[PDB]
Amino acid sequence: NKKPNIVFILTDDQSSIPINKPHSAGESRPFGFNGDKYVHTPIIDELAKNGMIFSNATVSTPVCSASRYSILTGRYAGRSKGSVFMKLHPKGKMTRVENNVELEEDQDNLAKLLQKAGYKTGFVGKSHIIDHNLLHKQEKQLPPFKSYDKKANPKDPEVNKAIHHNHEIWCKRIQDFGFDYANGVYAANLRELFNDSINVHNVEWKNKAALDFIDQVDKEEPFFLYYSETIPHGPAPWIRRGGKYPYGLDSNPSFNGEGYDNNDYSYLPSRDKIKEEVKRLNKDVDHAWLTWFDYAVGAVVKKLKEKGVYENTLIVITSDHGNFDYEKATLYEGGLEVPLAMHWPNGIKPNSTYDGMVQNIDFTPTFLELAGVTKVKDSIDGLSLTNVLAGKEKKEIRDYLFFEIGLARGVRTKDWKYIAVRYDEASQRIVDSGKMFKGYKGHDHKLPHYVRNGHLGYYGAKDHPLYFDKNQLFNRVTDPEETKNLYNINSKKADEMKKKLLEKLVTFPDRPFGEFINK
Ligand SMILES: [Mg+2]
Numbered sequence: 001n002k003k004p005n006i007v008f009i010l011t012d013d014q015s016s017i018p019i020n021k022p023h024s025a026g027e028s029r030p031f032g033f034n035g036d037k038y039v040h041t042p043i044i045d046e047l048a049k050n051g052m053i054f055s056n057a058t059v060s061t062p063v064c065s066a067s068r069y070s071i072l073t074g075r076y077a078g079r080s081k082g083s084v085f086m087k088l089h090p091k092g093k094m095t096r097v098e099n100n101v102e103l104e105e106d107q108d109n110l111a112k113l114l115q116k117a118g119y120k121t122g123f124v125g126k127s128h129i130i131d132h133n134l135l136h137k138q139e140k141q142l143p144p145f146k147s148y149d150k151k152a153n154p155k156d157p158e159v160n161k162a163i164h165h166n167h168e169i170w171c172k173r174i175q176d177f178g179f180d181y182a183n184g185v186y187a188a189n190l191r192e193l194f195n196d197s198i199n200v201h202n203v204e205w206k207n208k209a210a211l212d213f214i215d216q217v218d219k220e221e222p223f224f225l226y227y228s229e230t231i232p233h234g235p236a237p238w239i240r241r242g243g244k245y246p247y248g249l250d251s252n253p254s255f256n257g258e259g260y261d262n263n264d265y266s267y268l269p270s271r272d273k274i275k276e277e278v279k280r281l282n283k284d285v286d287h288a289w290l291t292w293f294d295y296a297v298g299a300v301v302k303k304l305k306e307k308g309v310y311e312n313t314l315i316v317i318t319s320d321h322g323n324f325d326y327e328k329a330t331l332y333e334g335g336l337e338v339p340l341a342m343h344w345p346n347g348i349k350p351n352s353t354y355d356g357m358v359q360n361i362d363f364t365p366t367f368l369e370l371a372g373v374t375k376v377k378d379s380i381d382g383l384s385l386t387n388v389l390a391g392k393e394k395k396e397i398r399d400y401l402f403f404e405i406g407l408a409r410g411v412r413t414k415d416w417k418y419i420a421v422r423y424d425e426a427s428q429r430i431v432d433s434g435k436m437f438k439g440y441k442g443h444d445h446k447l448p449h450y451v452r453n454g455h456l457g458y459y460g461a462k463d464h465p466l467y468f469d470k471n472q473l474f475n476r477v478t479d480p481e482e483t484k485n486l487y488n489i490n491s492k493k494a495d496e497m498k499k500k501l502l503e504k505l506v507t508f509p510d511r512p513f514g515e516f517i518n519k
Helices: 042-049 064-071 083-088 110-116 132-140 157-177 203-215 271-280 289-307 360-370 425-433 454-462 491-505
Strands: 005-011 052-054 120-126 181-186 223-228 313-319 340-343 352-354 401-405 408-412 416-421 471-475
Touching: 005 064, 005 289, 005 360, 042 289, 042 313, 042 340, 064 360, 083 132, 110 120, 110 223, 110 360, 120 203, 132 157, 157 181, 181 203, 203 223, 203 289, 271 289, 289 313, 313 360, 408 491, 416 491, 471 491
Parallel strands: 005 223, 005 313, 052 352, 120 181, 120 223
Antiparallel strands: 052 340, 313 340, 401 408, 408 416, 416 471
């Protein structure tokens, strides 16, 4: 009654950048409210129109684990004290953040804090931020997990049992980090299941898990639901093969992250009907997966209404980071920029917009304020958005944004972006040796990628001539596509931006970075 419910709905690798042509040529599309004219997302568009659209939402680290970490903590990913992260980055060494950060079992996170405030907390979908040591055991199918062949048939009773068993372990482990419920979970991505048949997205499976959570909330108790999609992450649902979409709408709805099960999803359209509707509206059939999702969000809104809690629920729709033009795990705009809308009938006026710089670190301090939490242990980097949400604040709430990905750090203002890349000791030694780096599919390279992941580095560098430039300065008014390095043309401005970067770097104890902070 006094505390609003929060439903946080997150897609995976979905830029806000619209694709202004009928064939998207291997790119994701954003929602209709982001300006894509080729999609059909009416429920989500109406939620956005009847709430607040943020046109300059960013993430501090544009790669899955790091973005998710920040979302659920309010802190920069470079502050993680996760077990794997600290083994890679002992005190006194620079950090190289990628998919290697996790929630710490004895530190604050949003879910733990909301539980202390009296919220029932629920988790559905993709994690990527819990127990990376256990993730390694999942990938290798080591105890406590059970093993199966990559080509195994999940209808096979012994195989189905193994995959179900592995899914139950993650449900239990996720609830050690502040959740009262966890179901429809993925430890990481579809890849890490190592099974061809279940290497498919399943909107319905996770949606039913979400609705089951909402059903079990007592009507007078506040709740928080973290609803984390796999879509449209690789293998992308839009991939057309033999006239079909085998990773999305034409996959078997019986295959899911827990194996095989014939569940009743008749409260959603059939997958065929989804495709039929998009084709009838002369919208892009490759991206019918967005309408598939729209209906799932529609079922959530229907359930909230039926329970009489819709008007006092804050629904957030966003993505963890972009992947436009292979700019995932870079500090270019196709990684940083994400869709963001917020809908809350009793707290946000409709037809609202905010164009100031906001960041994923802002979600936790915002929700904490709405939940009446005033005492936290771990310092928060983000800012509460509640004055923006209430329509009181129409100015910028910060002078600049900070970013970090692997060997790269960056800052941006409204009009300028600065990126610095500085090498770890191991990379620097290979560079000194004159030997090339062993690359993805034999694409060896002279200089390090920002990240250790050679697949991401290969794709991020392939059509980006400036990728390896150690100092990059872009004017966002004369060069929105970031094709012209002004570092040597505007040295005074570069120095001004370096000051802003240093102000953020010095807040990470025992973390050097090139000549900014010496080892
Ligand atoms: Mg992602």
